[PDB]
From Swiss-Prot:
Homodimer. This bacteria does not encode Cas2; Cas1 must interact with a different protein to insert spacers. CRISPR (clustered regularly interspaced short palindromic repeat), is an adaptive immune system that provides protection against mobile genetic elements (viruses, transposable elements and conjugative plasmids). CRISPR clusters contain sequences complementary to antecedent mobile elements and target invading nucleic acids. CRISPR clusters are transcribed and processed into CRISPR RNA (crRNA). Involved in the integration of spacer DNA into the CRISPR cassette. Acts as a ss- and dsDNA-specific endonuclease. Pfam families: Cas_Cas1. It comes from Pseudomonas aeruginosa (strain UCBPP-PA14). It is an enzyme of class 3 (hydrolase). The keyword rRNA-binding does not apply. Its cofactor is Mn(2+); Mg(2+). Inhibited by EDTA. This is CRISPR-associated endonuclease Cas1.
DNA sequence: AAGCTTCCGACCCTTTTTTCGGACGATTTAAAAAACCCTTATAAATCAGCAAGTTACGAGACCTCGAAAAAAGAGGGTTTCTGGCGGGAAAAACTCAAAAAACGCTTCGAAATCAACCGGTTATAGGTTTTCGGAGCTA
């Protein structure tokens, strides 16, 4: 249930959170034996209330006493609906509320306005993304066994070439387009491996074939996971690195990018070819995300870029 | 002392909850009615297989009504495909005009010519092979 070992983030489902006798208690079908009792309550913990759960104001009081962030997310924890805002660590605020302020916003803003540094960040994002493609498509054979048998030499050549291109070109405007070309080739490779036939990527949900729908669902979950990552870091969604400065919710899409083609896309084609239900697809996606430590990776990346930007 | 405003008691009426009583059902117990047993030698039933005559139970059919399901009919709405009409821009006819350019006069003497047949010229109809442009695709 520990959703991110890097963030001390826990997912609670099928239980009520209430305060009896001055201690926050979980009313669950397992009673005393539920693992929720092992939840450490400290300023380092952060909760994610899941499906079928409710919380009492008294609990909110006790958690605030202990300084524990709370957030509501849907099935499996991908769509993050609402959460507590996290503080910002600077010398002029200084409340004693015992809430672990986080300093990453200052680091982010310290460079966000300098375009050259912003570009350097974009490059760093894409380096990470490609290396996660090469990892999941080649190094690990779980997909191979599942049925996603694809050629390697063509994929390796394409990825090598795109990586070679990343280290070049002057502005965001090229990077976006280079990624788009890589995207197209990856789609073609996946369709060939899946024997799905010809594939064309419609957008704004105009597609009707299973592949398109499953891609949309997968991307929706990925966005939710990224939103969780940013919220844990406290960075507002508007300070995008690679998407346009006017794009509402740009940053989450920047962060979501580092898994779409690594983990969502193959599963979308696999499930479409296998003829799965939408529910089966959702469960498979969440299982893949859990297996890959996705949230932890996207946390590590954001921290790495912050430290590297100095 | 008077007027205004606010409680308070008395009451009137209907609805909602509780209590009690009565009735009905069910069960138990006791009393009454039907029944069982014990004495029978003699009269009637038991049964053997088949014939000859009859029918109580089963099957088939149809009707009757009622209800259920399905199909049709109605109405609410949204999306899109087409047609008609209106409006701006370009083309080409229409109107206005000049300046060439041709024609005629008009050429006696200089080419132009056709005819058949050879070799030779070369524009190009037709076919063959190939860059340029665009397909969009993808973030």
């Amino acid at each position: 249930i520990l959703h991110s070992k890097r963030a001390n983030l826990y997912y609670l489902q099928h239980c009520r959170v209430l305060v009896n006798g001055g201690r926050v208690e979980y009313v669950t079908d397992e009673g005393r034996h539920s693992h929720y009792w092992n939840i450490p309550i400290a300023n380092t913990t952060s909760l994610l209330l899941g499906t079928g759960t409710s919380i009492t104001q008294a609990a909110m009081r006790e958690l605030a006493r202990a300084g524990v962030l709370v957030g509501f997310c849907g099935g499996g924890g991908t769509p993050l609906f609402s959460a507590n805002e996290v503080d910002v660590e600077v010398s002029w605020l200084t409340p004693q509320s015992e809430y672990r302020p986080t300093e990453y916003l200052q680091r982010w803003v310290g460079f966000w306005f300098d375009e050259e540094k912003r570009l350097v960040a974009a490059r760093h994002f894409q380096r990470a993304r490609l290396e996660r493609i090469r990892h999941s498509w080649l190094e690990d054979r779980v997909l191979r066994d599942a049925g996603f048998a694809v050629d390697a030499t063509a994929l390796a050549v394409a990825v090598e070439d795109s990586a070679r291109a990343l280290e070049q070109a002057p502005n965001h405007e090229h990077l976006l387009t280079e990624e788009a070309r890589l995207s197209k080739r990856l789609f073609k490779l996946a369709a060939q491996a899946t024997r799905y036939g010809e594939f064309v990527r419609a957008k704004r949900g105009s597609g009707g074939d299973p592949a398109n729908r499953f891609l949309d669902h997968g991307n929706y979950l990925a966005y939710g996971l990224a939103a969780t990552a940013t919220w844990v870091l406290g960075i507002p969604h508007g300070l995008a690195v690679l998407h346009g400065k006017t794009r509402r919710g740009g940053l989450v899409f920047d962060v979501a990018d580092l898994i779409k083609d690594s983990l969502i896309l193959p599963q979308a084609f696999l499930s479409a070819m296998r003829g799965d239900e939408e529910q089966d697809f959702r469960q498979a996606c969440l299982d893949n995300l859990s297996r890959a430590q996705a949230l932890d990776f996207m946390i590590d990346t954001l921290k790495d870029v912050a430290q590297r930007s100095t």
